[PDB]
Symmetry: none
Subunit: 63 residues, 4 copies
């Protein structure tokens, strides 16, 4: 019965791609915004560290 | 000569705020996308490290 | 009489799959939105309980 | 220093509302899809329980 499978099965390759594409699109947008800020010399080193730490906290990346 | 100052003067508080709000908005969007990916257990530790390294490269943050 | 059967017959496997595919797609969208909210620590335990009770009421799931 | 605050400050009321609006919109979409499935009698009690458990897992709601 494929009907039960529609609810139970884990993410399909298409669904997994959609979630990653959203991460990629957000990463590009951040590069665009940070690229403009760095061009106008708006980010000090502590500010850069705080943005990096924020992203690592999003990622649950303990480094 | 206020007209000269319009072209010469450094970024105003309003313009600086606008540039940082764009960084903040992209940071929120990235937390939204990564939050969903982490919820579906889509990011391995190497993948997390690559995203973090990409952001540090955007920042020109040499750490 | 196949023309009568077209109106009378129960849902076909293709039709049943389309309906359950819509449930799956909504479930994924909810995991995406809740995943982001949980990442920003926006859901308290009573709020989580209200969302769960709302879904159980949709389901007519008396538990 | 308002520019620092733009990166450091916690989620604003407008940002918090946008995130929870996304949860509400997904909840409505799920009620629409489940409402149609329930109308065509497509959900058995175990299927209802699996959908509910999936949502509670999204919520990190340990009940």
């Amino acid at each position: 019965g494929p009907v039960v499978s529609i609810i139970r099965d884990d993410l399909t390759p298409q669904e997994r791609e959609r979630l990653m594409m959203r991460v990629r699109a957000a990463l590009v947008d951040l590069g665009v915004a940070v690229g403009a800020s760095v061009a106008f010399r708006q980010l000090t080193e502590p500010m850069k560290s705080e943005i990096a730490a924020t992203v690592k906290k999003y990622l649950e990346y303990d480094h």
